[PDB]
Structures are given as C-alpha cells and as structure tokens.
Amino acid sequence: SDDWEIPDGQITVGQRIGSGSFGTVYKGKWHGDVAVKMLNVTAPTPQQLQAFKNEVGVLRKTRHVNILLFMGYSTKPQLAIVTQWCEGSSLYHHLHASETKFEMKKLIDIARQTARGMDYLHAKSIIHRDLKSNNIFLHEDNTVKIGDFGGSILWMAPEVIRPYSFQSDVYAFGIVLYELMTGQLPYSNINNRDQIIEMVGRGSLSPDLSKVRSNCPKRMKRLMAECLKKKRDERPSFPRILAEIEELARELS
Amino acid sequence: DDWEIPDGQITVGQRIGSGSFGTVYKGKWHGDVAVKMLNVTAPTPQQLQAFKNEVGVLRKTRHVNILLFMGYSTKPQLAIVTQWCEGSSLYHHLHASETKFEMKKLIDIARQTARGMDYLHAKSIIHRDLKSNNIFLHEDNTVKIGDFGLATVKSRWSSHQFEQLSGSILWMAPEVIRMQDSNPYSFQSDVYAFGIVLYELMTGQLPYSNINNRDQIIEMVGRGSLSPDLSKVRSNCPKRMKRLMAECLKKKRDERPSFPRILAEIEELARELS
Numbered sequence: 021s022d023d024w025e026i027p028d029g030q031i032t033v034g035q036r037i038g039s040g041s042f043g044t045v046y047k048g049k050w051h052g053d054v055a056v057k058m059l060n061v062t063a064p065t066p067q068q069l070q071a072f073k074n075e076v077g078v079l080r081k082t083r084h085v086n087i088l089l090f091m092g093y094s095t096k097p098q099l100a101i102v103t104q105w106c107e108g109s110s111l112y113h114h115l116h117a118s119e120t121k122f123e124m125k126k127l128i129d130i131a132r133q134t135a136r137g138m139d140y141l142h143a144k145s146i147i148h149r150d151l152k153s154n155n156i157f158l159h160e161d162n163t164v165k166i167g168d169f170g171g172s173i174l175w176m177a178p179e180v181i182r183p184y185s186f187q188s189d190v191y192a193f194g195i196v197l198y199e200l201m202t203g204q205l206p207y208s209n210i211n212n213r214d215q216i217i218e219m220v221g222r223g224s225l226s227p228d229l230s231k232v233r234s235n236c237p238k239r240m241k242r243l244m245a246e247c248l249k250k251k252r253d254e255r256p257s258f259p260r261i262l263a264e265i266e267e268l269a270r271e272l273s
Numbered sequence: 274d275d276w277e278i279p280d281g282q283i284t285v286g287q288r289i290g291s292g293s294f295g296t297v298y299k300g301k302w303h304g305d306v307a308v309k310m311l312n313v314t315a316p317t318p319q320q321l322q323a324f325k326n327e328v329g330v331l332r333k334t335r336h337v338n339i340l341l342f343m344g345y346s347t348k349p350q351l352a353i354v355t356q357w358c359e360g361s362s363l364y365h366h367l368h369a370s371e372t373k374f375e376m377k378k379l380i381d382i383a384r385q386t387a388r389g390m391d392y393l394h395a396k397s398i399i400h401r402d403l404k405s406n407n408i409f410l411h412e413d414n415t416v417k418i419g420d421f422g423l424a425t426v427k428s429r430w431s432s433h434q435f436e437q438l439s440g441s442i443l444w445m446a447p448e449v450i451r452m453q454d455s456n457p458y459s460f461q462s463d464v465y466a467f468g469i470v471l472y473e474l475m476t477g478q479l480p481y482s483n484i485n486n487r488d489q490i491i492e493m494v495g496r497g498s499l500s501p502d503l504s505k506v507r508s509n510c511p512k513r514m515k516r517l518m519a520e521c522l523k524k525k526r527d528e529r530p531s532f533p534r535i536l537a538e539i540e541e542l543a544r545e546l547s
C-alpha cells in the first residue's frame with residue numbers, strides 16, 4: 021500500500037453529515053458516493069496532525085469486509101480522510117433509538133460479523149478503544165462496518181476506569197453482546213452517571229443477565245458472561261470468541 | 274514484503290472452481306474469504322511474475338465496486354486472497370438464470386459498474402476483458418469487478434487450448450479485433466466493453482444471438498459492418514441510456530466518451546427516476 025493521496029479538487033463535498041472523532045464529516049462525490057472527514061482549521065495542532073497520521077496509518081493496513089473501507093486522504097487543502105459511503109444506521113440507532121425488531125438469527129449474525137472484524141483488528145496488533153454500538157454501522161442493514169465514529173462509559177472496563185488492552189476490547193464486545201441479546205443498555209435502572217463509574221470500577225456493579233431473551237442461545241449467553249469477567253486476564257481471546265460464535269451460527273443455517 | 278499472510282492462518286475449504294491461474298477455494302480467515310492459489314511445487318518465472326503483477330495491481334484498489342483484495346501468501350504456494358461474496362455473476366443472472374430485474378436495478382448495476390470502471394481508469398488501470406461474467410453481484414445488490422475468467426491461449430499444435438477470452442470476443446472492440454498488436458487495448462476499448470454490458474443489461478440478451486460462428490463475428494465486427502441491434506432494448510429503457518450505450522459502442526476508438534462523462538450521465542439519469 022503506497023500513494024493513497026487524493027489531489028485537491030477531485031472530491032465534491034456535499035451535505036454536512038455531522039461531527040466525527042475530529043473535525044466534520046460530509047458526504048462527497050468521488051467515483052461514487054464517499055464520506056469525507058476533514059479538519060476545518062487553517063493550521064493543525066501537533067496533537068491534531070499526529071492523530072490524523074496515526075489514524076491514516078492504521079486505516080491503510082485494513083482490508084476486511086467488517087472494517088470501514090479506507091480509500092484515501094488529502095492534506096494540501098486541509099487534513100482529510102476518505103471512506104466508503106454506507107447506507108443504513110448505526111447499531112445503537114437500531115437498538116435504542118429506533119423500533120427495529122430484528123430476528124435472533126440477525127442478532128447472532130451481527131455478533132459474528134463484529135467478532136470477525138475485531139479478530140481481524142487484533143491480528144493486526146490494533147487496539148480499538150471506545151468500541152460501542154454507535155461505532156458499529158449497518159451497511160444496507162445487512163453488513164457490519166466497524167469504525168471510530170464521533171457517554172461511552174457504558175462499555176468501559178474496570179481497568180480503563182482507574183492502559184487499554186485487547187481484554188478491554190473483549191469486555192466492550194461483551195457489552196455489545198449484552199445490548200444485542202437483551203435489547204437495552206446495561207444499567208437503565210441506575211440514574212446517577214457518576215455513581216455508575218465508581219460502582220463499576222470498584223466492582224460492585226455488573227450487568228443484570230436476567231434481561232436476556234428466552235430464545236437467546238445458551239452458548240451465546242455463556243460466552244457473553246465470560247467476556248464480561250471482572251478480571252482482565254480471565255476473558256478469552258478473540259480467536260476463541262469468533263470460533264464459538266461461528267460454531268453457534270453454523271448450526272442454524 | 275507487506276500484505277503477506279503467514280502460512281497456517283487460512284483454512285482452505287471446498288473447491289469453488291478454476292480462476293485466471295490455479296484453483297479457487299473458499300477459505301476461513303477471520304471469516305469467509307476466497308483463495309486463488311497455484312498448485313505447483315516450484316513456480317515458474319511466468320507464474321511468479323503473473324502473481325506479482327496481479328498482486329501489485331490489486332494492492333492499489335480500495336473501492337466498493339472493485340473486488341476487495343485482502344492479502345497474499347507465498348510460503349505454501351502462490352496465492353491471492355479476496356473477500357467472499359454471496360450471489361452470482363451478472364452473466365448468470367441474465368443468460369443462465371434469466372432473472373428479470375426491475376429497470377431501476379438495471380440502471381443501478383450500470384451505475385455501480387461505471388463507478389468501478391471510472392475508479393480503475395483514474396488509477397491508470399486498463400481492465401481488459403470486461404464482461405457480465407466479470408461483474409459479480411454481491412448479495413445481488415452490490416457490484417464487484419474482478420478478473421474471474423480465463424484468457425485465450427492458442428494451441429501450440431492444431432485450434433484453441435484456452436478460449437474464454439474468445440468467449441469475450443463479443444465484448445471486444447473493433448480496433449482490438451483488427452490488428453491484435455502489442456496492447457491494442459485502451460480506455461476506449463473498456464468503454465466499448467461497458468457499452469456491450471449496457472446492451473446486455475437493457476436488451477437482456479447477447480449482441481449477436483442469431484450469429485453463432487465466432488469467425489463470422491470477428492470478420493464482420495473488425496471490418497465494421499456488424500454492430501448490436503439496438504431495437505432489442507426494452508420499451509421502458511430510458512432514452513438517455515440507449516443514447517449513452519450507442520455512444521459507447523462507436524466503431525471509431527476516439528469517438529466514444531471517457532468514463533468520467535459516462536459515470537456522470539448514468540448518475541444524472543439514475544437520480545431522476547428514484
């Protein structure tokens with residue numbers, strides 16, 4: 021992978037879609053529909069430039085169906101990152117902001133695609149911090165795309181509260197399994213935001229697994245409980261997680 | 274030495290078929306993938322050079338309408354890995370399954386193919402042998418462009434050992450047919466191939482159904498007397514679509530529009546019917 025810079029003037033920026041991890045995200049026209057994440061500043065700060073370079077160097081190493089397709093970047097007009105245009109909404113929107121009623125097979129398949137993406141990233145020695153249902157996009161409502169999109173304490177691990185590792189990502193994936201199988205956020209009953217942080221970091225608070233659906237598979241619930249282990253080094257690696265999820269899904273096709 | 278996949282990470286599965294070189298299987302590597310490997314003990318200079326050329330061309334592509342290259346392996350054997358797509362080729366849907374899409378779907382397939390081809394032309398990549406067999410319908414909704422078929426190889430002793438690119442003679446342009454010199458292919462020949470694809474999309478059949486002899490097609494098209502019958506287009510086919518298809522099928526090489534203009538026309542057409 022080399023020479024991925026897009027010259028200025030080739031992209032036609034369109035409607036502003038919102039604010040991303042840094043800068044603003046628009047929909048652009050460049051050999052089809054694309055998404056442009058730009059930094060609307062005249063001169064970027066050292067922090068901004070280093071974050072841009074790190075994110076671009078991480079994106080140029082990814083070629084997987086369940087990872088958002090990086091396509092190029094621009095620096096001459098301003099810092100910009102170009103990705104594929106996806107049709108659909110984030111998993112958080114489907115679960116907690118919309119009334120979409122998925123099938124259990126669809127939930128299992130979403131979990132499997134997310135596990136595939138995360139195992140791919142871990143194979144590249146890439147720790148994805150701030151993993152949540154907002155960061156899992158449903159392309160055409162059928163394909164999972166993982167990315168760092170633009171409150172995230174719900175997925176935070178006890179160690180991160182007190183430093184990021186693969187095990188924190190496994191715990192975040194466990195929380196994702198929780199919101200997939202139950203349908204709601206982990207601690208709805210707890211209302212004080214600061215209380216949740218201290219309680220979970222201390223270790224007294226943990227998700228209520230009675231919220232899982234009756235048709236939720238046994239092995240799926242057991243794996244979700246194993247991924248949400250309070251101890252950092254008690255959680256399985258993502259190869260075993262993907263293997264269990266694939267063995268579960270492959271018996272329903 | 275980047276993008277190399279270590280040995281043992283991929284679990285090769287059911288043989289899916291024969292690719293451009295070697296054999297193509299479905300494999301397990303962080304999910305479902307497709308592996309095109311060369312089942313030889315020691316590769317020849319030609320085989321290794323072809324592998325390296327294809328890998329170097331694939332490593333420059335990151336587009337939704339181009340088949341996603343994922344990596345390669347060399348320790349067990351020369352192999353190229355791409356994403357696993359569910360569905361069938363456009364040729365299968367049109368002439369082997371006779372699936373009747375809606376006009377919107379035909380327009381959208383043409384639009385996605387135009388996106389992919391304009392992307393490739395922007396990278397100075399001339400994709401020869403563009404046809405409906407080389408256009409895969411991932412989930413029957415997304416276009417993926419790739420080199421799935423075989424090339425034409427003349428038999429050393431008599432008339433053809435390989436003839437799949439002679440199967441693509443239907444999509445060959447008159448200039449490519451005539452002289453067959455060192456690379457008669459151009460961006461305009463790809464434009465003509467895309468025009469033939471538009472023809473089989475809007476009519477539903479191959480350009481020369483009544484003519485069966487390949488030599489007749491060669492002589493007639495190269496001479497300049499033969500061209501697809503555009504009366505076979507459907508009545509609901511847009512006028513602009515037929516006009517663009519006729520402009521892409523111009524007998525002269527330098528009378529056909531470039532793929533930026535083609536993609537612009539197709540996108541402006543599609544955005545007026547949604």
Ligand SMILES: CCn1nc(C#Cc2c(C)ccc3c(Nc4ccc(Cl)cc4)nccc23)c2c(N)ncnc21
Nearest residue numbers: 037045055056057088101103104105106166167168169
């Ligand atoms: C609803 C609003 N919305 N936002 C879109 C976007 C975007 C992004 C852009 C432009 C650039 C970088 C991103 C990125 N970086 C990244 C870093 C590390 C790794 Cl491993 C993976 C990804 N993560 C996530 C997203 C982007 C978007 C779209 N593409 N289609 C439809 N709606 C969309």
Ligand SMILES: CCn1nc(C#Cc2c(C)ccc3c(Nc4ccc(Cl)cc4)nccc23)c2c(N)ncnc21
Nearest residue numbers: 289297307308309353354355356357358418419420421
């Ligand atoms: C018929 C059954 N079949 N065959 C699949 C495959 C494959 C390929 C592999 C493994 C490697 C290289 C390819 C390639 N090279 C290439 C060169 C230049 C350019 Cl620009 C673009 C592509 N062109 C086409 C395909 C492959 C396949 C799949 N991925 N999913 C489902 N069914 C499938």
